[PDB]
Amino acid sequence: NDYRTFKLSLLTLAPIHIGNGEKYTSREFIYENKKFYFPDMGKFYNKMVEKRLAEKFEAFLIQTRPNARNNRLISFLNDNRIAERSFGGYSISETGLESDKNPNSAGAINEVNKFIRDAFGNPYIPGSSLKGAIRTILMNTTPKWNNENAVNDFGRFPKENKNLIPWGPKKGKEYDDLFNAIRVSDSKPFDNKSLILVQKWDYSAKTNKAKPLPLYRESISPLTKIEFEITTTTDEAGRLIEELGKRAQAFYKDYKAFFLSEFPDDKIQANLQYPIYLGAGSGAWTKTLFKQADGILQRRYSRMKTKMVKKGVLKLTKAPLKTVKIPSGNHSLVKNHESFYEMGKANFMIKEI
Amino acid sequence: TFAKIKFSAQIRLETGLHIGGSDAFAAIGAINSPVIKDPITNLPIIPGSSLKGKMRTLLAKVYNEKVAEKPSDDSDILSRLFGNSKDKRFKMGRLIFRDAFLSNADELDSLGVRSYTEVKFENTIDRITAEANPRQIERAIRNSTFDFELIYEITDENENQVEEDFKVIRDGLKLLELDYLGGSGSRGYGKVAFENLKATTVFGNYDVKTLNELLTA
Amino acid sequence: MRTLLAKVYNEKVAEKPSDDSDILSRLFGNSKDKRFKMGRLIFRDAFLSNADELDSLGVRSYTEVKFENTIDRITAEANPRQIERAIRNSTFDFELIYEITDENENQVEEDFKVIRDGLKLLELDYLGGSGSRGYGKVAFENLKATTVFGNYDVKTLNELLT
Amino acid sequence: SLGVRSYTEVKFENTIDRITAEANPRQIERAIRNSTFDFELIYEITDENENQVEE
Amino acid sequence: ILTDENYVDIAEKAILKLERNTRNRKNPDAFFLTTSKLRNLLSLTSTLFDESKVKEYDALLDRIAYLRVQFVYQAGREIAVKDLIEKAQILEALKEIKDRETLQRFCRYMEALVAYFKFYG
Amino acid sequence: ILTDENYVDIAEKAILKLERNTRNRKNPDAFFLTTSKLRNLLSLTSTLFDESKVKEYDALLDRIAYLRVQFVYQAGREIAVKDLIEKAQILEALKEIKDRETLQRFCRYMEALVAYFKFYG
RNA sequence: ACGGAAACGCUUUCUAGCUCGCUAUAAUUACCCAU
RNA sequence: AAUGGGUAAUUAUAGCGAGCUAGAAAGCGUUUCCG
């Protein structure tokens, strides 16, 4: 009876991609209609061996063309007159903002990522992913854990002192383990049709053109309501969960103070709820207790993909424009044209039972 | 007078539980933390020890005043049903937790199932410097329904209590729904439901008509 | 199988195996009686019958090791166990020599109410080891009686082993 | 060559004392199964048999 | 060809035959093949090694034939992978993969390639 | 090389040759190799030591060849394990593992390494 | 016409009771490359 | 400038590795033949 649950009604106000660690490469999707289709490529290969095209198909996956739509899998169907859907059935619709808006380059996307799913096929946001977003809010807005952390004591600096929040069995003394007493459950498995497959857009202060990037994360469409059960046992983990309305705003206000300053206000959008950042999006300042990582964090990229002289680069999408119209008037949901959202910007509200 | 009482509940998952083992020769870039399977059928199972370890350790905060340091210090309502090795008369007490193997072998199929165990990639993200540390753990899939087969054991010592020793069974079948049935538990991993309980008498001609109707509240 | 049958046929709590009643002691034997030694039943060790049938299937080794830590009650430590146990569908040849002494009289049919019930309690209780944590669930199948020594008719008895 | 390092196995058993349930272990040594022992029974024939060498 | 005895020292000698970056002697002996490129080939094989222990061969051979697609496609572009599959006889090892024991041998042969790549790196 | 007489004092002298944390003299003499890292190598060998007592050598040598994968992969990353397998001659001991008696000797040689690690810790 | 003859080292006995493979862990980071 | 491509990291980390009860317990230690 010491348990007391919560209902974190997560509302996506941004493209949110989560998980699965694997990717559909190029030549593994067909742009037949104005909707994508991701077959089972073992089942695709078995039908095509029966249609006697396997030597042509391996000769298809070696030669490039100056055009790009003839280097996708739909050209192998039209040059050999394939007339069935019939494969490992998974298909999403599209918007037109996936590829370059110009028609010639349309449907020539490459290397989409995947979204985490169960073995049934219906996607969900897992509880392990939603809990890592809560932990950074609970990291950065305590004054006791955001101290001079990340003592290496050996070798190279990136070693965070993970033994700063008590979590182990800790022999002799009594088991406290705060994060054992915060128990984030998974989502309900929602539908495939809220997936829009955005691409990542980098935006810096200098070089004001927002450069494209060939990431093609299949993300959740915004304005989708996803609920979570978060059950807490003890008093200390009990109090830190309804406090999140004052913790996530205090996180984001400290996170508006830099990396959301020094930018135009056009690309950044409003909050309208309690803000939170899920995975695979704006990172390294959201997936980071950020005050002690700024000096340290840029050491890892003295490379060709060099992290800039400033803090970092803004992470952006191009998703279809929607409004909520919840305040007096239609809430404009952006401060620009041309469909820029920032990736991973979620919102929630919390309530017991 | 001697009697045995069987409880054929059905353990249906909502978040997929991870009762681990260790495949010692696992692989690189594969499941480095598997679930325990049935050794022939390779279906994921729930052992009775993971059930009995979560029945007792959740009823040791409810039906145990002067909270126990060891399992030998349980305050002799819990030791009467879960056994107590440091006692003259409580060794092997009256409950047998049979393993819940699998029931819906072909009801999970015709929903679309490649394998009966899903694989989840999980990534300990270092907060400072954003280092990544992935892990791949197995889970029994969402709508998997297991065969709970708890067996009660009536001697001539049981007299008045018989029925007192089922509210602790009914609450153990209820305090675990508010918790996880093992697992990398904090994140999801066994938020489980104990559906359609049914007590029957499998030996000794004992009546369970008044016994069933206190398991439906 | 004695202690399961001890809870049915004693009428008082026997503090010793010698204090079991005269229906247990004339099957399992008693040492304090000079009349119930050389007990009637002879139990032989059960070996793997289906060692070839567990071969060519999804199992490789005939024993699987189960990893089983405990959790400390107040400090939540761990202490990992590795308890070996036989795999699921192993089938064991079981034989149950009963010796019809000339003093048996009409007790032969009373004993088979006891042995079958001893085989029916083992299908409800466990068989060896950590039985309140699983590890039991023994099913006796293909129960039938044959006369390995002559001059007895089990035609009206194999229906009791249905 | 059917690898056996010592020809006598050691079987571990116990006793569960009734009403106290405290075990009482035991280590009894047994010759292993496919040991084959040579048996020689000798029936001696004299003139005092008189057609009893088939009974 | 690779048997249950020699599927590791073939894989060790294969990694040593990968020609290094003899150019640009600052931080020398680096391979043209890179780590995250090789793990793409392993993630193919180290999900059949899991499913072979659970499923049979005949309900699984559709993904096995698609390895011959992937190991050619990943090596048809970005020529350092073609340097692997010609030296480490990958495409020849997929010719003989007729059983679960050989499926679990080639999927384990790829893990020896990732091991000595990480060791000699 | 290790025989039935010397497979323990070789393993004792191996652990003493592991270079300590000479840096950071608060709680000194700690090893760069850690306990839970070493047990990953033992769990490999202390499941062949069980199956060698039950099975024959020829129906078991596929997992034996994969030890040469694992002891290189676990030592190719996180260099403190490479400090073990160069000092404790692990990869040389896997060259001579042709019989059940040597398989039960190396799998018992690893247990002496875990023993003196726990003792000198 | 053997310090011999006849004599089962044997009867009864569960390797058993207690024990969660658990604890912490966003599949994520970086922003270019080819000509 | 357009075009065509993604690329590089980490692949589990740290802990426990069994603990405690019982360690044999009841009988028979010669009987019969014999003077």
Side-chain angles (χ1 to χ4, degrees), chain A residues 1-99 103 106-206 208 210-293 295-324 327-329 331-353, chain B residues 1-155 157-217, chain C residues 1-37 39-101 104 106-162, chain D residues 1-47 49 51-55, chain E residues 1-24 28-121, chain F residues 1-24 28-121:
Chain A
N1 55 1
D2 201 2
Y3 299 94
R4 56 184 294 269
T5 69
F6 292 96
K7 296 300 293 296
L8 190 144
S9 296
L10 196 282
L11 180 62
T12 65
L13 274 309
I16 292 173
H17 178 269
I18 298 293
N20 205 3
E22 61 188 2
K23 58 187 181 293
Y24 296 109
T25 63
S26 180
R27 288 86 177 271
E28 287 182 351
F29 63 97
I30 56 99
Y31 181 69
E32 182 177 0
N33 301 118
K34 286 177 94 288
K35 59 185 288 292
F36 292 157
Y37 182 77
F38 293 98
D40 189 76
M41 295 300 291
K43 190 182 264 79
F44 180 77
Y45 184 76
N46 197 3
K47 186 65 68 179
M48 181 266 299
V49 169
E50 292 180 353
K51 288 185 179 182
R52 191 179 59 85
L53 289 170
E55 292 293 328
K56 181 67 175 66
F57 183 75
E58 291 183 355
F60 181 75
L61 299 178
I62 49 93
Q63 189 267 329
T64 60
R65 280 81 178 271
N67 195 358
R69 55 96 60 217
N70 54 5
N71 290 118
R72 300 295 183 269
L73 194 64
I74 195 64
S75 177
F76 184 77
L77 303 185
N78 294 119
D79 292 330
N80 297 114
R81 275 75 177 175
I82 300 298
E84 70 271 14
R85 294 181 184 271
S86 295
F87 295 120
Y90 176 65
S91 68
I92 62 168
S93 296
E94 60 90 18
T95 62
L97 298 174
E98 293 84 8
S99 67
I109 67 170
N110 48 0
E111 194 191 7
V112 309
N113 294 114
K114 293 184 188 179
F115 197 85
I116 187 65
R117 292 176 185 177
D118 55 356
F120 293 159
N122 295 317
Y124 68 99
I125 293 176
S128 176
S129 177
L130 194 273
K131 189 172 181 176
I134 296 173
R135 192 184 181 191
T136 52
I137 295 170
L138 298 178
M139 283 293 182
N140 273 313
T141 58
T142 52
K144 63 188 289 185
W145 296 336
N146 203 357
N147 55 357
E148 292 88 3
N149 199 357
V151 53
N152 50 0
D153 202 3
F154 293 100
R156 277 82 63 197
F157 293 99
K159 294 184 287 293
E160 182 188 2
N161 204 167
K162 297 290 180 67
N163 290 318
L164 184 138
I165 298 174
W167 59 268
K170 299 285 102 175
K171 66 173 290 294
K173 67 180 290 294
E174 188 177 0
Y175 177 76
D176 48 358
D177 198 359
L178 185 68
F179 282 149
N180 195 5
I182 297 169
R183 292 177 178 177
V184 178
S185 70
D186 293 328
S187 299
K188 300 282 102 174
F190 57 91
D191 198 2
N192 289 314
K193 304 298 183 291
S194 65
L195 295 173
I196 53 175
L197 201 148
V198 301
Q199 60 176 349
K200 184 176 175 181
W201 287 91
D202 291 335
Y203 183 75
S204 176
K206 79 277 290 178
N208 201 5
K211 292 176 95 288
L213 198 64
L215 272 303
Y216 282 92
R217 298 181 178 92
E218 54 175 3
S219 299
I220 301 171
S221 67
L223 276 71
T224 58
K225 299 182 291 294
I226 301 167
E227 292 89 6
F228 290 94
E229 297 183 359
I230 298 171
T231 303
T232 57
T233 77
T234 186
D235 195 4
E236 183 178 0
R239 292 182 291 112
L240 294 179
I241 300 301
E242 71 266 8
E243 189 64 28
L244 283 174
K246 301 285 102 177
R247 303 293 297 272
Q249 292 180 355
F251 170 70
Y252 179 72
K253 183 174 174 65
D254 292 332
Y255 178 59
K256 190 181 286 295
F258 69 100
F259 189 77
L260 277 303
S261 67
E262 73 264 10
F263 282 157
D265 294 331
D266 293 331
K267 270 68 186 299
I268 308 163
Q269 72 271 19
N271 298 113
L272 71 87
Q273 285 179 357
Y274 296 151
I276 194 166
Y277 286 94
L278 270 298
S282 64
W285 297 97
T286 61
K287 280 81 176 174
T288 293
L289 63 96
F290 55 88
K291 292 181 181 179
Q292 309 68 348
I296 297 63
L297 171 60
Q298 284 81 244
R299 187 179 292 115
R300 295 178 69 249
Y301 297 107
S302 67
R303 289 180 184 269
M304 295 301 292
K305 70 286 290 178
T306 301
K307 190 170 184 287
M308 289 180 180
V309 182
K310 68 176 79 68
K311 274 76 67 178
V313 179
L314 185 62
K315 277 79 178 175
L316 294 174
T317 67
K318 282 186 178 294
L321 194 279
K322 288 186 261 74
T323 58
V324 291
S328 66
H331 187 276
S332 64
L333 191 271
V334 289
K335 285 184 279 184
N336 56 357
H337 297 285
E338 66 182 3
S339 296
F340 280 104
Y341 297 167
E342 62 178 1
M343 193 184 286
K345 185 70 180 295
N347 289 110
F348 68 98
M349 70 283 198
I350 194 163
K351 182 174 87 274
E352 185 176 1
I353 302 295
Chain B
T1 300
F2 184 76
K4 301 297 287 292
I5 305 302
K6 187 184 286 185
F7 283 85
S8 298
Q10 293 294 321
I11 302 171
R12 182 178 291 170
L13 297 166
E14 282 86 5
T15 60
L17 90 173
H18 175 73
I19 297 174
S22 294
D23 192 0
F25 287 104
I28 299 99
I31 292 100
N32 48 7
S33 295
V35 299
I36 184 164
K37 281 89 167 179
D38 189 73
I40 296 171
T41 319
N42 285 315
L43 293 177
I45 66 169
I46 294 173
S49 68
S50 180
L51 293 168
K52 191 179 185 70
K54 292 297 291 186
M55 295 298 108
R56 176 181 281 176
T57 55
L58 292 178
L59 293 168
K61 296 184 264 75
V62 176
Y63 288 157
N64 191 1
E65 65 271 16
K66 188 253 178 66
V67 292
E69 183 178 2
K70 289 182 180 179
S72 298
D73 293 330
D74 288 328
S75 181
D76 70 1
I77 303 300
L78 192 66
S79 293
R80 292 188 296 114
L81 291 183
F82 288 92
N84 192 359
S85 67
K86 261 60 187 299
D87 190 79
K88 292 172 70 175
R89 66 180 184 177
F90 286 155
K91 297 180 181 181
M92 188 61 210
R94 297 201 293 269
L95 290 184
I96 292 96
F97 285 88
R98 298 287 167 84
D99 294 341
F101 287 100
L102 204 281
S103 63
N104 51 2
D106 52 356
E107 196 270 330
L108 292 173
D109 290 329
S110 68
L111 290 174
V113 165
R114 296 292 91 194
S115 295
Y116 290 95
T117 61
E118 63 179 354
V119 183
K120 177 169 168 58
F121 300 165
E122 281 183 346
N123 213 169
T124 306
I125 293 170
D126 196 359
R127 294 294 185 269
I128 301 298
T129 65
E131 289 285 330
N133 194 3
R135 63 185 182 272
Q136 307 188 0
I137 66 170
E138 285 186 354
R139 300 167 69 186
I141 62 171
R142 179 176 179 87
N143 284 315
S144 295
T145 299
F146 294 89
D147 286 330
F148 188 70
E149 290 292 327
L150 187 147
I151 294 169
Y152 188 70
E153 186 265 336
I154 300 173
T155 59
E157 192 269 333
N158 286 352
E159 337 287 19
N160 46 348
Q161 51 188 307
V162 178
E163 296 293 328
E164 184 179 0
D165 286 334
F166 296 107
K167 295 179 176 66
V168 53
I169 293 176
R170 186 259 181 275
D171 289 329
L173 273 283
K174 182 67 173 66
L175 268 293
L176 200 276
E177 293 176 353
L178 298 175
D179 205 0
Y180 54 88
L181 202 154
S184 166
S186 159
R187 317 145 278 258
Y189 292 160
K191 300 284 103 175
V192 76
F194 286 146
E195 296 179 356
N196 61 12
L197 280 76
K198 183 179 184 294
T200 183
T201 303
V202 291
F203 190 74
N205 294 117
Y206 181 75
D207 50 350
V208 293
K209 301 286 102 176
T210 186
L211 199 155
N212 288 315
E213 57 93 20
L214 59 92
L215 295 172
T216 60
Chain C
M1 196 175 75
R2 187 167 184 174
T3 62
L4 295 177
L5 288 174
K7 298 179 187 294
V8 181
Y9 295 100
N10 280 324
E11 291 94 13
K12 70 180 178 67
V13 180
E15 65 182 0
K16 288 171 92 287
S18 297
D19 295 334
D20 290 331
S21 66
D22 57 352
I23 189 168
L24 269 296
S25 296
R26 66 182 173 88
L27 288 174
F28 295 96
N30 194 357
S31 64
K32 301 289 104 177
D33 286 334
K34 68 178 177 65
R35 58 181 293 165
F36 285 159
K37 298 180 186 293
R40 218 159 288 176
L41 291 191
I42 296 168
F43 298 173
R44 299 285 163 81
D45 299 343
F47 298 96
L48 280 174
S49 67
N50 58 357
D52 55 355
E53 192 271 330
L54 296 173
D55 285 329
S56 69
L57 269 70
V59 74
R60 191 185 64 188
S61 182
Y62 293 97
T63 62
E64 69 97 15
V65 183
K66 180 167 171 56
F67 293 164
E68 282 181 349
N69 63 5
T70 189
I71 301 299
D72 189 76
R73 186 63 58 84
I74 61 167
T75 62
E77 299 176 358
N79 208 166
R81 298 180 282 125
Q82 302 187 0
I83 291 178
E84 181 176 0
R85 45 93 166 260
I87 63 169
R88 179 190 171 90
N89 283 321
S90 297
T91 307
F92 289 95
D93 283 331
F94 177 72
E95 60 186 2
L96 200 290
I97 293 293
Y98 181 80
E99 181 176 359
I100 303 169
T101 315
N104 280 343
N106 33 69
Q107 286 162 314
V108 192
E109 72 273 15
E110 187 181 5
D111 291 331
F112 296 154
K113 189 180 183 294
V114 178
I115 299 166
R116 189 266 308 163
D117 204 1
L119 294 174
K120 196 260 185 179
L121 286 172
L122 284 173
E123 294 181 355
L124 294 177
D125 204 76
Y126 63 94
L127 183 66
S130 299
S132 64
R133 291 183 289 274
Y135 292 174
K137 188 66 182 295
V138 163
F140 293 100
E141 65 186 5
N142 299 114
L143 289 172
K144 68 181 180 67
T146 183
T147 63
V148 299
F149 187 72
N151 288 320
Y152 189 75
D153 196 1
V154 294
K155 182 68 176 176
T156 58
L157 196 271
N158 289 318
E159 294 178 353
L160 274 299
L161 299 173
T162 301
Chain D
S1 67
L2 297 171
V4 170
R5 299 281 79 80
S6 181
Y7 297 104
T8 69
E9 62 171 347
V10 177
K11 190 179 191 294
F12 288 182
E13 293 182 351
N14 58 4
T15 303
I16 288 160
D17 283 284
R18 322 274 211 77
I19 314 322
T20 188
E22 169 56 62
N24 192 2
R26 178 172 64 250
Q27 306 183 1
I28 56 100
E29 184 177 1
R30 295 185 295 118
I32 67 170
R33 290 180 65 193
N34 287 325
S35 299
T36 303
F37 291 99
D38 189 74
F39 175 67
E40 294 182 357
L41 184 147
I42 292 92
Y43 186 70
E44 296 173 353
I45 301 302
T46 184
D47 203 3
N49 293 320
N51 206 167
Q52 292 174 354
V53 202
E54 294 296 328
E55 185 180 0
Chain E
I1 191 167
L2 49 90
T3 59
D4 285 328
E5 184 180 3
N6 56 3
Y7 67 94
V8 179
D9 52 355
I10 289 172
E12 183 183 4
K13 287 172 71 175
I15 301 299
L16 269 297
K17 288 182 183 294
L18 266 72
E19 48 89 19
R20 285 91 171 99
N21 288 318
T22 62
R23 295 177 65 188
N24 305 105
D29 290 331
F31 296 170
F32 281 96
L33 185 64
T34 61
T35 300
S36 295
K37 184 64 67 175
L38 180 56
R39 300 289 301 178
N40 289 320
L41 298 176
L42 186 66
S43 176
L44 298 162
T45 60
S46 296
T47 184
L48 294 178
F49 181 74
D50 298 326
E51 293 182 353
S52 61
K53 293 188 285 186
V54 179
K55 296 176 184 176
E56 289 85 4
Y57 185 80
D58 293 330
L60 198 275
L61 55 89
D62 54 354
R63 290 179 183 267
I64 298 172
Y66 182 64
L67 290 179
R68 193 171 186 270
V69 178
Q70 287 293 109
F71 281 100
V72 169
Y73 173 71
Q74 295 299 113
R77 56 100 177 268
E78 293 177 353
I79 198 167
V81 189
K82 181 175 170 64
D83 190 74
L84 180 67
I85 58 99
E86 293 291 327
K87 293 178 180 179
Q89 291 84 17
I90 300 298
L91 271 299
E92 291 86 3
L94 290 172
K95 297 291 185 181
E96 61 183 5
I97 198 166
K98 285 93 173 66
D99 197 74
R100 289 180 66 249
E101 182 66 29
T102 313
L103 177 62
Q104 293 178 357
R105 192 184 299 119
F106 174 72
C107 293
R108 195 178 296 119
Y109 169 72
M110 287 296 293
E111 300 176 2
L113 290 174
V114 180
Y116 288 107
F117 185 83
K118 187 73 173 178
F119 181 72
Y120 297 102
Chain F
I1 191 167
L2 49 90
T3 59
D4 285 328
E5 184 180 3
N6 56 3
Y7 67 94
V8 179
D9 52 355
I10 289 172
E12 183 183 4
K13 287 172 71 175
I15 301 299
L16 269 297
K17 288 182 183 294
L18 266 72
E19 48 90 19
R20 285 91 171 99
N21 288 318
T22 63
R23 295 177 65 188
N24 305 105
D29 290 330
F31 296 170
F32 281 96
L33 185 64
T34 61
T35 300
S36 295
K37 184 64 67 175
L38 180 56
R39 300 289 301 178
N40 289 320
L41 298 176
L42 186 66
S43 176
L44 298 162
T45 60
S46 296
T47 184
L48 294 178
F49 181 74
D50 298 326
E51 293 182 353
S52 61
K53 293 188 285 186
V54 179
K55 296 176 184 176
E56 289 85 4
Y57 185 80
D58 293 330
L60 198 275
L61 55 89
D62 54 354
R63 290 179 183 267
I64 298 172
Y66 182 64
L67 290 179
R68 194 171 186 270
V69 178
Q70 287 293 109
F71 281 100
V72 169
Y73 173 71
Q74 295 299 113
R77 56 100 177 268
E78 293 177 353
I79 198 167
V81 189
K82 181 175 170 63
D83 190 74
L84 180 67
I85 58 99
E86 293 292 327
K87 293 178 180 179
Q89 291 84 17
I90 300 298
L91 271 299
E92 291 86 3
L94 290 172
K95 297 291 185 181
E96 61 183 5
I97 198 166
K98 286 93 173 66
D99 197 74
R100 289 180 66 249
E101 182 66 29
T102 313
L103 177 62
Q104 293 178 357
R105 192 184 299 119
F106 174 72
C107 293
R108 195 177 296 119
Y109 169 72
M110 287 296 293
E111 300 176 2
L113 290 174
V114 180
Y116 288 107
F117 185 83
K118 187 73 173 178
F119 181 72
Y120 297 102

